[PDB]
Design a protein around this ligand. Sequence first.
Ligand SMILES: C/C(=C/C=C/[C@@H](C)C(=O)O)[C@H]1CN[C@H](C(=O)O)[C@H]1CC(=O)O
Lengths: 84, 146, 159, 146
Amino acid sequence: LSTRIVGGIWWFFTLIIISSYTANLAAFLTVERMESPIDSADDLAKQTKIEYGAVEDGATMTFFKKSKISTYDKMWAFMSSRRQ
Amino acid sequence: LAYLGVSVVLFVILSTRIVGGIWWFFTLIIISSYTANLAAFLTVERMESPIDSADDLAKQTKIEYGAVEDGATMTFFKKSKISTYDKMWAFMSSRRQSVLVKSNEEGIQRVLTSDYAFLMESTTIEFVTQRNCNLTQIGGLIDSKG
Amino acid sequence: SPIDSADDLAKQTKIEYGAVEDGATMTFFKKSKISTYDKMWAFMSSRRQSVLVKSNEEGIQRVLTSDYAFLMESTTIEFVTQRNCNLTQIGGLIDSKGYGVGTPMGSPYRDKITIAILQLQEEGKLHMMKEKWWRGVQNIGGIFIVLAAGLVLSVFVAV
Amino acid sequence: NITDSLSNRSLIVTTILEEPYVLFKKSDKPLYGNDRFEGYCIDLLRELSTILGFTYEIRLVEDGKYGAQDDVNGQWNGMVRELIDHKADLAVAPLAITYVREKVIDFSKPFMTLGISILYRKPNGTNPGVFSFLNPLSPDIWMYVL
Ligand SMILES: C/C(=C/C=C/[C@@H](C)C(=O)O)[C@H]1CN[C@H](C(=O)O)[C@H]1CC(=O)O
């Protein structure tokens, strides 16, 4: 009689452990899939984790400063907030 | 209640195969629904982005922020070299009578009371983090002076 | 997430909104440079003639009919929460505004707004006159239904 | 000065169809004049009658709006046009402070202080019943499983 209860709570424990592992793996895979491969700088606008910028002041500085497209203006805002 | 139903099954006991299939299927639907709820809760937890830079503070109006009035910080912010600092000064002017303080320790206790982001000097950040462990800094140096 | 301010409306652009026409703080939101309210003025100026209401009640009935968001003053919202229990207020008093009466130069009530109506405020007359105008599961159950029907079938097979 | 002529003068009240507690009183007799409306502005006009005692013409308007200027016109229409085209040269109107009403209205202390908030309906948010049978997946795969 006690062996049925032992098997029931063991199945319950293994099911909870497997479900928690599956949920953690699903959350990690969803974060990794949300972190898309970077192309055409609209991923650069979203992903602030990978820092970037131009080389220094000059043609690349003034082109992004004068840009009114608001993607490259957001680029200039990000690279001018941390320009040092 | 499901265990009460299982006890009813144990009281009343082809039919065994279908009641085992029904119980196993009901168990896996309950387990899968719990697993999807846990996966959604873990996904929305890991998708949280805590505010780190002033760019994070600019797009959010829920967390109030500010500095000590006439302490040369909003003098820098009203120059508005970057549009993020223009939004900072615009929120400071729109909430002039709301989130402005007169002392550094007055701005400290508003952070300790409610959700507040105090803009103040980075060397005194080292003092208030060496003293109190409940407070910290976010981001680096917005503007360098001496 | 459920809506807590206009920042949530900036995040959730699925549910649209509207405001009173002409100069009901659209030009104020045109002049405002808060980034969330920059997005708010940008979307409601893209929807300037598309999704907008003219009167106060026209936007109110839009929330009464459909899931409409309605940005207005606290006085009208505070009046209609007493009128209908189905309506809620989202956020707080963000934009400070003064509803007041203009005065002539040298009129006797010009300073008595600041004295005698201030004496009404000190005696509190201005707020209870406002008060006297306006007072101010599921899926698991379905799973249990299906499981109970299967249990009835299993009992009726089992005997 | 016209101070010797402005005394004992009739005062013109030009308001619009206000808040829904400020309307015509419900009676069989059309009580007009100073009894045309009952509301908080009417209570403030009773207070001004205790302050001034001048005769007040509480009457409706032909436009019914606190209009502003246009880009193609340049003239502030509505009640601002009423207060500049000599219907009442003294700017007396209950409205909110705008960017342009600081200079086109002589103005006084605002009696009412208010904010801008969001009005939304309260949702039920309840969908009870057997909806594992009513998933967003098609029931073609469900009868395939059957
Ligand atoms: C009651 C009201 C109605 C709408 C007026 C608009 C359509 C107008 O007069 O151009 C006014 C009161 N003062 C507000 C303002 O000046 O912004 C305006 C809108 C409101 O009720 O908030």
